[PDB]
Design an enzyme around this catalytic site. Structure first.
Site, short mmCIF file in Angstrom:
data_model
loop_
_atom_site.label_atom_id
_atom_site.label_comp_id
_atom_site.label_asym_id
_atom_site.label_seq_id
_atom_site.Cartn_x
_atom_site.Cartn_y
_atom_site.Cartn_z
N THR B 1 1.17 -1.27 -0.02
CA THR B 1 -0.06 0.02 0.11
C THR B 1 1.00 1.13 0.02
OG1 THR B 1 -1.64 -1.34 1.14
CG2 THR B 1 -1.94 1.13 1.11
N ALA B 49 -6.95 -1.02 9.18
CA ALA B 49 -8.25 -0.90 8.79
C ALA B 49 -9.20 -0.27 9.83
CB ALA B 49 -8.74 -2.13 8.32
#
Lengths: 250, 212, 245, 243, 198, 242, 245, 233
Positions: B1, B49
């Site tokens: 990411t 998350a």
């Protein structure tokens, strides 16, 4: 339940008076004769311990309490008030000086504690003061021999010699002349006996009189029958037999 | 990411990857990576998350409240610091957050704050966060120029992402481009890596100066 | 209006505050309940007043269990009775969990009893104003106890209360005296019905519904049960027999 | 003085009634609900020529589609306004959607009863309930435009028009005749001010009135002063031509 | 660490604080003031974690500034230091300690003398003419004890600090990219925007 | 106990405690604030006939909340100190969390909430002091002057007076100052404030204390000497009609 | 009931100050005097001892004079009991300030904590206020000598000479007249001793019926050396002034 | 006198009623009238919704509390709200914990205790509200009358709110017909609209703002509003 009386139960007026206190001061006067002499050669306290029924014993009644091994106290007023305040007075003396500072409390500083409790139970609502006045007598190397009165007011003062309860004004007066700066403990026991003789007769015998002294002591009860670390506590309270014997030579 | 954001004349360029994986096989080419708090603040997903998700809606409640009650435009400067201060409370509670708090308000201009779970809040022109970040930084740095046009800025951003995509396998499902303006953010489309690779490898001639 | 009628944060010159005295007076204008001690059990009965045809027969009940073998009925103010019982339950369960046994009646009595006394030493917490006839059987026999407003309780062998108290107590003592204590549990059901029927004569501007229960060592096998079916029809028969019918 | 458990014959505490009297002495607030909008007018009131405009609150935002008008004391409505913003913000966090007009109202009014050292699963600790009533307007997707009248006594009524104030008498009776199911947003604002000038004993101006409305076109919009004056000036012509 | 130096000249305290944060191959950020101004004649410089720094800083500035207005005068370097240490000593017992170790460069403006303080993240307090953090001091204490002796003007302090920083960047393997220099005196806090031999 | 009926409505709708609060204000000193449009002047009375005290051990009339926020009061001394402590905690907390030097209005919202708070809910009794909170919000050339009451209301105000001789100073502000067109000079704003407090104090410039706040932290309190030269000037304007 | 046994007197009078507070002031004016004189080379404190007799210990005159700090001391006017609670809290507050900022408490800072509690005592709880006024004697290195007073109303002021307790008017009047700012310790003492005389009506005034302290610069300190006089030291100064009274 | 047994929750009377109970009983009547009738398979509530302002809009004042439970109010609406609030919470806790569906008698008992704790402190209070609770459990149909006085009786029929006595006298007569009619809704509903019209004597009856609520074996909790009451007038 709580939370119904959270206004103080002393209030002022333009005469500045505190209701509860004036009533409670009166109670002290209606106690029995208790006195204190500092003879500046010790301290001697005496009071009357007296029956209230023919089958009440007086050898289950004391008005002389030890607060700590070497500070003693005497009072006039309400019996209950004295025992409950005495428990709390004991509490702070033991936990806060003998564990923190490792020694017995200084009198004047203990006078500050006992005052603060009484003044506190007036300042806080829902409860009243104690209706007693105590005379707290103690000894220390640092301060000498000392005597204070702590009032129901939570005010304090020191007094060379004083008396409280019934026959207060006359008892203090006769005493003031007979009080010298340099006074022998035996003569100071006689003067106390003599005073209590003037308050009461027809029930005045020496085994109903309870006298305690700050000065002479018994090492043999302080666990120094053997070799001493030190001499130890100066308060020792007489038994009845000792009191009666001296009353004969009064 | 791998996510980057840089401050320039036209506002802010924010560029992000998207990729969800089952194995090393790309399960979905899709997933958010800009959490749109409100139209004026962006916080970019590069942390845990749940952590990012929970505190950034909660941050949306503090911005909405400040403007509703105090009738005052909230700063980016205030947005980051509210966030950092709570973060330090949840520090060593298991928190993982790496976000950049982006806004462009009237009173500060374009402002990008890097905020992490360590509670650090730093203002900078240029912040790249990720783990393909060092490589992504390379492309950006060697072609960096503050005075630039929005279109050319978008192309540089997207090549930087590509560079990081090729080497590092935690990016590269797709690229989402957004340019963050005063009046709110403008989406610049979704670009497939397959089609984008062949153009760049030939076009840029960086690490490709003799074609490889 | 003396603060011996508006507060219980003091002792009275009558040794009780006026409001507690008043609780005792309100039990007596109330509804009739009795309790019959017998040599193997206890029997309870209460008069349930009928005021309309809108009430349902036995789908409103006044005798409520605590545990499974102690039966409680009370006369007097309805809300105060719910609260007393709810407490009674919390004690009973705590006892069963903690000592692994059903609770004794002199024990159970001390636990409710101390709680009725508590609400009578505070200046703003309501007294109770129910008299509770309660009891059951345990491992050294049957016991009948009666608890009052003021926190007063003793063991009874016969007990009566309410509007029809006078009448009730008259029949009840005659029968108890005649018997070793109350004879069989079975005989006592009928007898119990006569007292309640007899007390109803003191209030004929209303109807009654006779409600009986029992708790008997070998005649319920340690349990408290409602008295119903045949056993209720028989007690009715006996009652309408003597009080003419 | 008066206990927190001392009722009137009707079940109603002294203290509750007494709040309700002070409400009626505030400023005039009038709300009319149609299915084309809800228009809210209030008199803002200038307490002196040296009191600055829009420093006194009479039109408040609870949320971006939700308003309230107040009558009584202005500080006492602040504890309510706070609770109402909080309720709105929280429901939106949890459920990502709007609070219904009713729901919002209930949440404030549960905490307007209270008072005394009581509790029963509700925390009560106030010395008094609030001295203020508020006309709570909103639009919600389901029920559309609605108007609700909140009493600080824990009582709530659903309304299609209501006026409160010291000008209540004229304004509610006028409102009944004026009420219709739909009529244009511009006609409605003009008409509200007409009603206000009637119960007002003095000249009506924009330095003691602020208007506001709620639209599905763009949410809670305070209809501002400059724009409102130009309507008051038309009012002078239309009114002295029926005379 | 974050390399943090200090030197106390006869009129002033010159404090040198790194200007860069370096992440592998390249400098990720390279505009780094690692110090925060408490008051116009109280400065505190910092090393430790990156996050502890700002969180403590802002908490502490706010408290001091509250004391300044309540009591209606600027708090002494001495007043700040005793305050700073006492908070750090508490934190160690708790789950989360503030792990910033500091240099407080102050002008005592009430008796007219500069003072320099090194206070550790635990609470270890020392007053020093010159001091350093970590492994820095092995190499740079060897140049400062030898070539410097007190009562040397401000410019001589600038040249010494640069020699110290050069030796650090050469011989010690840490990488911190020079120093950004700030001077604390009665004229306040000034930036030396040169570091070329200063 | 004390968690109830300190504060309740009458059936007349007066509050006891608020009504006796406003009375402490009329009795006490006098404070006034007049706004320019690039200044705010705060003039204060401190009234003592007994002359055996100094100004430097008698508390100041204008207290700093921040360098650019000032507070003035009339009322009890005791109560006002409570309010002042909250306002300083609220200045520094705001600066911390939102990272903006303070907005003066938000600070009014905090002092006003406290004042509302002890009235609405029991376990505390209300205050008997009214305040003027004034200052400059950052990036503004426009002066801010607010009034907050024991009720806990607040609003923003062009000149305002409280305390002894509210009527007299009110008339003077009505006839000599406008909301529309105030002083535009700093000088003229000083002249006006002195003119207003001079009519009421019944002393010279030795019991009027002027403090002038120009933008963002620029505060200078003119001294007895400086005020006297305007006091002279004032006796001259008044001897054109005498 | 007991919700109407509330005194409701820690609420405002229309006079702009609480009932109990105003009434309490009277109480002070009926207890001992404290006089505070601030000089240009000291601070002189005099207090007249309330009850003096042989039955009392006469060698004690710290019954109202306590030093709170090394350079701060207070004088009491009011009752012993009321005083003690504020004395102890001021002492701790001194130590909290000392510990936090590494410097001694300024006189106004200390005053201000005591005064916020005095107000507090009526503000939370409904309880009664104090019955004590202090006159504070202290030095701080930012203003020179400071001499202040606080009252149970929580209002405080600074003065160059003040008196509190009984006979405030009489003493204050004389003080304002003889005051100078070129006085020395010894010139103040003489002054003090005159004033005290003119407010007490006697044949003679004795040294044990006074409690005295002065806080002078000293000659063992550049600070201020606090000298607490005891009866025998009062006796000496009485000769030195040649003011027998 | 007044002041002895008013506000004082700790006092008693020789009669056992205080002033605070008699006012509470009056308060029930000052709400609108609502009547209850049930068989053994259904329970019905018929309630009149009559606005108290000219502009006011009709809103439900019968509130469904659970799938197998509800109540209608008569009396004070805030007082009614808190109890309804506690009962919805209570309903949930039984369902999660014990899977228990409440019978009316059980809830009732709970309800008495709640009021009882608040009549043992001056800072709490007694209520001012009666409630008719209907529910259908496995012991058939039920209708309960809850009183602030803690008198709970489960009845076949009743009425509370103003002018109770019209309806009670009718309800005691049609008693015998209605209780033996099982599995048929429409007759019991119709009879409820007739009952409530004898309560009214001078107050309107509204043909689109009546609201009837029913629960039963074949009926889960439905309030008929607007149109759907027509065929039972």
């Amino acid at each position: 339940m709580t939370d119904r009386y959270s206004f103080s139960l002393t209030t002022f007026s333009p005469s500045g008076k505190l209701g509860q206190i004036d009533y409670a001061l009166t109670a002290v006067k209606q106690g029995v004769t208790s006195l204190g002499i500092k003879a500046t050669n010790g301290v001697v306290i005496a009071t009357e311990k007296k029956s209230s029924s023919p089958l009440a014993m007086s050898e289950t009644l004391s008005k002389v309490s030890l607060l700590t091994p070497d500070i003693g106290a005497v009072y006039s007023g309400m019996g209950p008030d004295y025992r409950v305040l005495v428990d709390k007075s004991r509490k702070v003396a033991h936990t806060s000086y003998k564990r923190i500072y490792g020694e017995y409390p200084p009198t004047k500083l203990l006078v500050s504690e006992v005052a603060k409790i009484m003044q506190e139970a007036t300042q806080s609502g829902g409860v009243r003061p104690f209706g007693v006045s105590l005379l707290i007598a103690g000894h220390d190397e640092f301060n000498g021999f000392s005597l204070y009165q702590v009032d129901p007011s939570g005010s304090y003062f020191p007094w060379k010699a004083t008396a409280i309860g019934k026959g207060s004004v006359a008892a203090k007066t006769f005493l003031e002349k007979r009080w010298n700066d340099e006074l022998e403990l035996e003569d100071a026991i006689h003067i106390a006996l003599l005073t209590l003789k003037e308050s009461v007769e027809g029930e005045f015998n020496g085994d109903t009189i309870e006298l305690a002294i700050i000065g002479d002591e018994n090492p043999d009860l302080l666990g120094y029958t053997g070799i001493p670390t030190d001499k130890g506590p100066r308060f020792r309270k007489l038994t009845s037999q000792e009191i009666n014997d001296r009353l004969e030579a009064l | 990411t791998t996510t980057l954001a840089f401050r320039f004349q036209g506002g802010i360029i924010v560029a992000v990857d998207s990729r969800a994986t089952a194995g090393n096989w790309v399960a979905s080419q899709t997933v958010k990576r800009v959490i749109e708090i409100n139209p004026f603040l962006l916080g970019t997903m590069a942390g845990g998350a749940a952590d990012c998700q929970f505190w950034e809606t909660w941050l949306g409640s503090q911005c909405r409240l400040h403007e509703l009650r105090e009738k005052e435009r909230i700063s980016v400067a205030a947005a980051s610091k509210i966030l950092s201060n709570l973060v330090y409370q949840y520090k060593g509670a298991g928190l993982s957050m790496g976000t950049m708090i982006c806004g462009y308000t009237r009173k500060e201009g374009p402002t990008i704050y890097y905020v992490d779970s360590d509670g650090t809040r730093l203002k900078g022109d240029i912040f790249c966060v990720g783990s393909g970040q060092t490589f992504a930084y390379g492309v950006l740095d060697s072609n960096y120029k503050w005075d630039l046009s929005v279109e050319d800025a978008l192309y540089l951003g997207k090549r930087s992402i590509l560079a990081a995509a090729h080497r590092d396998a935690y990016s590269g499902g797709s690229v989402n481009l957004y340019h963050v303006t005063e009046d709110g953010w403008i989406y610049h489309g979704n670009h497939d890596v397959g089609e984008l690779f062949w153009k760049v490898k030939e076009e840029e001639g960086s690490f490709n100066n003799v074609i490889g | 209006g003396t603060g011996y009628d508006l507060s219980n944060s003091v002792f009275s010159p009558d040794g009780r505050n006026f409001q507690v005295e008043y609780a005792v007076k309100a039990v007596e204008n109330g509804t009739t309940s009795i309790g019959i001690k017998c040599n193997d059990g206890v029997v309870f009965a209460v008069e349930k007043l009928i005021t309309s045809k809108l009430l349902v027969p036995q789908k409103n009940v006044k005798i409520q269990v605590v545990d499974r073998h102690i039966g409680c009925v009370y006369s007097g103010l309805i809300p105060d009775g719910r609260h007393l019982v709810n407490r009674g339950r919390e004690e009973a369960a705590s006892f069963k969990k903690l000592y692994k046994t059903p609770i004794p009646i002199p024990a159970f009595a001390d636990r409710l009893g101390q709680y009725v006394q508590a609400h009578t030493l505070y200046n703003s917490v309501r007294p109770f104003g129910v008299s509770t006839i309660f009891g059951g059987v345990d491992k050294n026999g049957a016991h009948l106890y009666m608890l009052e407003p003021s926190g007063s309780y003793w063991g009874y062998k016969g007990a009566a209360t309410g509007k029809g108290r006078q009448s009730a107590k008259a029949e009840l003592e005659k029968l108890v005296d005649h018997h070793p204590e109350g004879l069989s549990a079975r005989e006592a059901v009928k007898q119990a019905a006569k007292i309640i029927y007899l007390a109803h004569e003191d209030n004929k501007e209303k109807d009654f519904e006779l409600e009986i229960s029992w708790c008997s060592l070998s005649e319920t096998n340690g349990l408290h049960k409602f008295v119903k079916g045949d056993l209720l029809q028989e007690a009715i028969d006996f009652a309408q027999k003597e009080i003419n019918g | 003085d008066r206990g927190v458990s001392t009722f009137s014959p009707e079940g109603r505490l002294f203290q509750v009634e007494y709040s309700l009297e002070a409400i009626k002495l505030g400023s005039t607030a009038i709300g009319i609900a149609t299915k084309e909008g809800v228009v809210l007018g209030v008199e803002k009131r200038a307490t002196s020529p040296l009191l600055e405009s829009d420093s006194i609150e009479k039109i408040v935002e609870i949320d971006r589609h939700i308003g309230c008008a107040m009558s009584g004391l202005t500080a006492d409505a602040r504890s309510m306004i706070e609770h109402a913003r909080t309720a709105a913000v929280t429901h939106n966090l949890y459920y990502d959607e709007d609070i219904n007009v009713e729901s919002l109202t209930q949440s404030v009014c549960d905490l307007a009863l209270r008072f005394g050292e009581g509790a029963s699963g509700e925390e009560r600790l106030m010395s008094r309930p609030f001295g203020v009533a508020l006309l709570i307007a909103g639009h919600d997707a389901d029920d559309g435009y609605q108007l609700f009248h909140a009493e600080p006594s824990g009582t709530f009524y659903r309304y299609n028009a209501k006026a409160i104030g010291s000008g209540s008498e004229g304004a509610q009776a006028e409102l009944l005749n004026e009420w219709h199911s739909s009529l244009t947003l511009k006609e409605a604002e003009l008409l509200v001010l007409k009603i206000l000038k009637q119960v007002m004993e003095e000249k009506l101006d924009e330095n003691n009135a602020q208007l506001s409305c709620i639209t599905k076109q763009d949410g809670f919009k305070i209809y501002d002063n400059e724009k409102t004056a130009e309507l008051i000036k038309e009012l002078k012509e239309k009114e002295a031509a029926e005379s | 660490m974050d390399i943090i130096l200090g030197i106390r000249v006869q009129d002033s305290v010159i404090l040198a604080s790194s200007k860069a944060v370096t992440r592998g191959i390249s400098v990720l950020k390279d505009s780094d003031d690692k110090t925060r101004q408490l008051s116009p004649h109280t400065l505190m410089s910092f090393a430790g974690e990156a996050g502890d720094t700002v969180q403590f800083a802002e908490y502490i500035q706010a408290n001091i500034q509250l004391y300044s207005i309540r009591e209606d005068y600027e708090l002494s370097p001495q007043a700040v230091s005793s305050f700073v240490r006492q908070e750090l000593a508490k934190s160690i017992r708790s789950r989360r300690p503030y792990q910033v170790n500091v240099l407080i460069g102050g002008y005592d403006k009430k008796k007219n003398k500069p003072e320099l303080y090194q206070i550790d993240y635990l609470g270890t307090k020392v007053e020093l003419p010159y001091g350093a953090h970590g492994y820095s001091g092995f190499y740079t204490f060897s140049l400062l004890d030898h070539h410097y002796r007190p009562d040397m003007t401000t410019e001589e302090g600038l040249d010494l600090l640069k020699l110290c920083v050069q030796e650090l960047e050469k011989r010690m393997p840490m990488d911190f990219k020079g120093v950004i220099v700030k001077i604390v005196d009665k004229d306040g806090i000034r930036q030396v925007d040169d570091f070329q031999a200063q | 106990g004390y968690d109830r009926a300190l504060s309740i409505f009458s059936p007349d709708g007066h509050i006891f405690q608020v009504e006796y609060a406003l009375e402490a204000v009329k009795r006490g000193t006098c404070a006034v604030g007049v706004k320019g449009k690039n200044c705010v002047v705060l003039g204060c009375e401190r009234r003592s006939t007994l002359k055996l005290q100094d100004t430097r051990i008698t508390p100041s009339k204008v207290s700093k909340i921040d360098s650019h926020v000032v507070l003035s009061f009339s009322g009890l001394n005791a109560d006002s100190r409570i309010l002042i402590e909250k306002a300083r905690v609220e200045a520094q907390s705001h600066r911390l969390t939102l990272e903006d030097p303070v907005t003066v209005e938000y600070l009014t919202r905090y002092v006003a909430g406290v004042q509302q708070r002890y009235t609405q809910s029991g376990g505390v009794r209300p205050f008997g002091v009214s305040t003027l909170i004034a200052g400059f919000d950052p990036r503004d050339d426009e002066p801010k002057l607010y009034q907050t009451e024991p009720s806990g209301i607040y609003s923003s105000w062009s000149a305002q007076t409280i305390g002894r001789n509210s009527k007299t100073v009110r008339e003077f502000l009505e006839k000599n100052y406008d909301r529309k067109e105030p002083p535009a000079t700093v000088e003229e704003c000083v002249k006006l404030t002195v003119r207003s407090l001079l009519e009421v104090v019944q002393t010279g410039a030795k019991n009027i204390e002027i403090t002038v706040v120009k933008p963002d932290s620029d505060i200078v309190a003119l001294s007895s000497e400086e005020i006297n030269q305007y006091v002279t000037q004032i006796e001259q304007e008044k001897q054109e009609q005498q | 009931g007991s919700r109407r046994y509330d005194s409701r007197t820690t609420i405002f009078s229309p006079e702009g100050r609480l009932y109990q507070v105003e009434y309490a002031l009277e109480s002070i004016s009926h207890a001992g005097t404290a006089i505070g004189i601030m000089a240009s080379d000291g601070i002189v404190l005099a207090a007249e001892r309330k009850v003096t007799s042989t039955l009392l210990e006469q060698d004690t005159s710290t019954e109202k004079l306590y030093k709170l700090n090394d350079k701060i001391a207070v004088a009491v006017a009011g009752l012993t009991a009321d005083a003690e609670i504020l004395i102890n809290t001021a002492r701790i507050h001194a130590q909290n300030y000392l510990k936090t900022y590494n410097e001694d408490i300024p006189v106004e800072i200390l005053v201000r904590r005591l005064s916020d509690i005095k107000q507090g005592y009526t503000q939370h709880g409904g309880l009664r206020p104090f019955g004590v006024s202090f006159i504070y004697a202290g030095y701080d290195d930012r203003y020179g000598y400071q001499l202040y007073t606080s009252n149970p109303s929580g209002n405080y002021t600074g003065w160059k000479a003040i008196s509190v307790g009984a006979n405030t008017s009489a003493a204050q009047t004389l003080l304002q007249m003889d005051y100078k700012d070129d006085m020395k310790v010894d010139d103040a003492i003489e002054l003090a001793l005159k004033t005290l005389s003119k407010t007490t009506d006697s044949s003679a005034l004795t040294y044990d019926r006074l409690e005295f302290a002065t806080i002078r610069k000293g000659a063992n300190d550049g600070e201020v050396y606090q000298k607490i006089f005891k009866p025998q030291e009062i006796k000496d100064i009485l000769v030195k002034t040649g003011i027998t009274k | 006198f007044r002041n002895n047994y008013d506000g004082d929750t700790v006092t008693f009377s020789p009669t056992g009623r205080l002033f605070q109970v008699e006012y509470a009983l009056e308060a029930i009547k000052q709400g609108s009238v609502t009547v209850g009738l049930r068989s053994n398979t259904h329970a019905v509530l018929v309630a009149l919704k009559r606005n108290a302002d000219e502009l006011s809009s009709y809103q439900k004042k019968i509130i469904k509390c659970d799938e197998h439970m509800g109540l209608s109010l008569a009396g004070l609406a805030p007082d009614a709200r808190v109890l309804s609030n506690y009962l919805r919470q209570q309903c949930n806790y039984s369902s999660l914990v014990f899977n228990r569906k409440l019978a009316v008698e059980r809830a009732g008992h709970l309800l008495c205790d709640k009021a009882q704790k608040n009549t043992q402190s001056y800072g709490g209070r007694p209520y001012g509200v009666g409630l008719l609770i209907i529910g259908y459990d496995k012991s058939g149909a039920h209708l309960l009358e809850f009183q602030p006085s803690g008198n709970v009786t489960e009845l076949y029929g009743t009425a509370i709110g103003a002018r109770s006595q019209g309806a009670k006298t009718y309800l005691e007569r049609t008693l015998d017909t209605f209780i033996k009619i099982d599995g048929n809704p429409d007759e019991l509903i119709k009879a409820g609209v007739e009952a409530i019209s004898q309560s009214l004597r001078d107050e309107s009856l509204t043909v689109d703002n009546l609201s009837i609520a029913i629960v039963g074996k074949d009926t889960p909790f439905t309030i008929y509003d607007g149109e759907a009451v027509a065929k039972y007038i």
